[PDB]
Amino acid sequence: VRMNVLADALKSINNAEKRGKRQVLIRPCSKVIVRFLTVMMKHGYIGEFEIIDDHRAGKIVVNLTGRLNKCGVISPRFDVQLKDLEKWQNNLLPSRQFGFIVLTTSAGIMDHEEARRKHTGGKILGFFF
Amino acid sequence: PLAKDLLHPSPEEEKRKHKKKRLVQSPNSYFMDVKCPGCYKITTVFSHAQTVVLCVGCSTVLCQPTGGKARLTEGCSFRRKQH
Amino acid sequence: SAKIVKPNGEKPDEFESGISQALLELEMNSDLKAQLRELNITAAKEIEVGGGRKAIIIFVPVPQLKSFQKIQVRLVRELEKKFSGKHVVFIAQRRILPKPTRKSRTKNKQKRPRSRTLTAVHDAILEDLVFPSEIVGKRIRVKLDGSRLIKVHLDKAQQNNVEHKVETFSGVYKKLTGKDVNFEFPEFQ
Amino acid sequence: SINSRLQLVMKSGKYVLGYKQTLKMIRQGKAKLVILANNCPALRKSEIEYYAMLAKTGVHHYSGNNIELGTACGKYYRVCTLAIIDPGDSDIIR
Amino acid sequence: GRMHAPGKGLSQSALPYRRSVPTWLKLTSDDVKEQIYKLAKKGLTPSQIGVILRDSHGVAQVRFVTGNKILRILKSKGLAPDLPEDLYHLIKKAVAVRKHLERNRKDKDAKFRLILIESRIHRLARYYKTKRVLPPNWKYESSTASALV
Ligand SMILES: [Mg+2]
Incomplete structure (x- = not known):
């Protein structure tokens, strides 16, 4: 069933941007969704998303742009110990020149660059690039 | 295709969508404030009835229930408009 | 004269007196009476808005709110006309408990209901502001900066009362809560 | 059927199970539905059915067993006859 | 897709945004709790009450009219x-x-x-x-x- 609500959503926003779809809604919604999408907003990977408030769960509607090649999700949230952060961002991103492993540490949800500035580890969620 | 303004969907194309599939989940049902010929009394019948709606008076019976909406009996009116 | 319909620890005369005196003035009045004896405010503030024409926000205990709603339209009409050049609106004085971190712990402390949590409060604050309009649905923007702008769909029944106000409400929580919101007057189902 | 109604009378109302009490409650006149089963042997049938007719009490020959009655009474056990004194909300009485 | 059958269907109830009572209604939190009350007394299930109350009667949802949901009204009085x-x-x-x-x-x-x-x-x-x-x-x-x- 709905186990992981990212994988759910991120499939459907990778899986639109292939078709070139202009915008998409994501059915279940969550806090973690919002908080990881707002990360994608900063590096440009999407445009402004506007969350509907069906009284229950939430829907979102994501303005897409052309720019997202793929976003995916590492499904079990392994615990990343900062020394490993490299070994991951080697084998999970296309280059050292862009690509963003979104993860979730002590000091909020954020990309790997921002966990490195603050010097924290934590749990991998996914990656967009 | 390539541009469907999902957030501002024109009123028609939610009514041709299954209740839960809509942008916001709303029902496709209603109450009706019902006259009936004998008594002037108005009962507050819910379209999709399930049970037989009897008159606040007594004798007459308003709504046989069927699959979807309720079958009003013979010659009796109703009033949607609200909310 | 002032102090008899505002009891909560908070006196500070200025408006609270003048506004409660206008409540007391509305008791010298047929039918708008007796139902007003039971009622009672707590505090009140003057707050300006972007346009210039400031609004008076009135707080209420909370259990009385559901009785203030019976009077509100008749109330506002009269004291808005009295205490002129200004908009008036009622809110319930909700508590907002802090979140129990492990830091701010669980030494004892009775629960902390959802009613009394954070996001319930500013949401019930919405239902207190636009009493006559009533909410039909919210959307919630995220601009490319990250600034979260809400959009509140209100109904239509008693739009006429509320349509002129709007940017008072926009001004209102931005003092109370700290959130920026504009109101839209839409289709039906 | 008189499983559902009877069930409700047990919980809420008043009763007497079996015999002798039931017949006393007819004697007294304070019992106004005697539920026989089938399997009440046909003398007792006719002598309760008579002995109630005279009081002016409704009788029921429940399509039962002695047992399918016990089970229906929420009793866990053999009840041939029973008498209902007072129902709850149950419209067992007509 | 259901617990125990192939049929992967969906047919369910669906409430609106709005929750505030719909103004037809007279009654009030008391007179509903007076009525749930008399139906449960007579012998009906918590589902079955919710029913009678909507078709014939008036209350979209008890829960919204009163504070709590039907079961709690019966349970806190001991008709459960x-x-x-x-x-x-x-x-x-x-x-x-x-x-x-x-x-x-x-x-x-x-x-x-x-x-x-x-x-x-x-x-x-x-x-x-x-x-x-x-x-x-x-x-x-x-x-x-x-x-x-
Ligand atoms: Mg199975």
């Missing part, structure tokens, strides 16, 4: 049933399947619909043991079941 209505509907069903299986020992079909039904019982039961509405002891037994209805 012994076990959950939701469960003895399965138990009553089981005992009905039992019966005709006991006359017709060929019905292979009835010998899921029993096994399934038994399993939808046990399954239910063992939260009612962790949510603690049932005491940690009660158990099915075929024999003692027919009585329990």
Whole structure:
């Protein structure tokens, strides 16, 4: 069933941007969704998303742009110990020149660059690039 | 295709969508404030009835229930408009 | 004269007196009476808005709110006309408990209901502001900066009362809560 | 059927199970539905059915067993006859 | 797609944004709690009350009119049933399947619909043991079941 609500959503926003779809809604919604999408907003990977408030769960509607090649999700949230952060961002991103492993540490949800500035580890969620 | 303004969907194309599939989940049902010929009394019948709606008076019976909406009996009116 | 319909620890005369005196003035009045004896405010503030024409926000205990709603339209009409050049609106004085971190712990402390949590409060604050309009649905923007702008769909029944106000409400929580919101007057189902 | 109604009378109302009490409650006149089963042997049938007719009490020959009655009474056990004194909300009485 | 069947259907109820009462309604939190009250008294299930109250009567949802949901109104006054209505509907069903299986020992079909039904019982039961509405002891037994209805 709905186990992981990212994988759910991120499939459907990778899986639109292939078709070139202009915008998409994501059915279940969550806090973690919002908080990881707002990360994608900063590096440009999407445009402004506007969350509907069906009284229950939430829907979102994501303005897409052309720019997202793929976003995916590492499904079990392994615990990343900062020394490993490299070994991951080697084998999970296309280059050292862009690509963003979104993860979730002590000091909020954020990309790997921002966990490195603050010097924290934590749990991998996914990656967009 | 390539541009469907999902957030501002024109009123028609939610009514041709299954209740839960809509942008916001709303029902496709209603109450009706019902006259009936004998008594002037108005009962507050819910379209999709399930049970037989009897008159606040007594004798007459308003709504046989069927699959979807309720079958009003013979010659009796109703009033949607609200909310 | 002032102090008899505002009891909560908070006196500070200025408006609270003048506004409660206008409540007391509305008791010298047929039918708008007796139902007003039971009622009672707590505090009140003057707050300006972007346009210039400031609004008076009135707080209420909370259990009385559901009785203030019976009077509100008749109330506002009269004291808005009295205490002129200004908009008036009622809110319930909700508590907002802090979140129990492990830091701010669980030494004892009775629960902390959802009613009394954070996001319930500013949401019930919405239902207190636009009493006559009533909410039909919210959307919630995220601009490319990250600034979260809400959009509140209100109904239509008693739009006429509320349509002129709007940017008072926009001004209102931005003092109370700290959130920026504009109101839209839409289709039906 | 008189499983559902009877069930409700047990919980809420008043009763007497079996015999002798039931017949006393007819004697007294304070019992106004005697539920026989089938399997009440046909003398007792006719002598309760008579002995109630005279009081002016409704009788029921429940399509039962002695047992399918016990089970229906929420009793866990053999009840041939029973008498209902007072129902709850149950419209067992007509 | 359902617990125990292929059919992956969806047909459910669906409420609006709005929750605030809809102004037809007279009654008030009391007169609804006066009426739930009299129906449960007469002998109806918490579902069945919710029903009567909407079609004939007026209340979209009790929950919205009063503070709490039907079960709590019965339970806080002590008209609530012994076990959950939701469960003895399965138990009553089981005992009905039992019966005709006991006359017709060929019905292979009835010998899921029993096994399934038994399993939808046990399954239910063992939260009612962790949510603690049932005491940690009660158990099915075929024999003692027919009585329990
Ligand atoms: Mg299975």
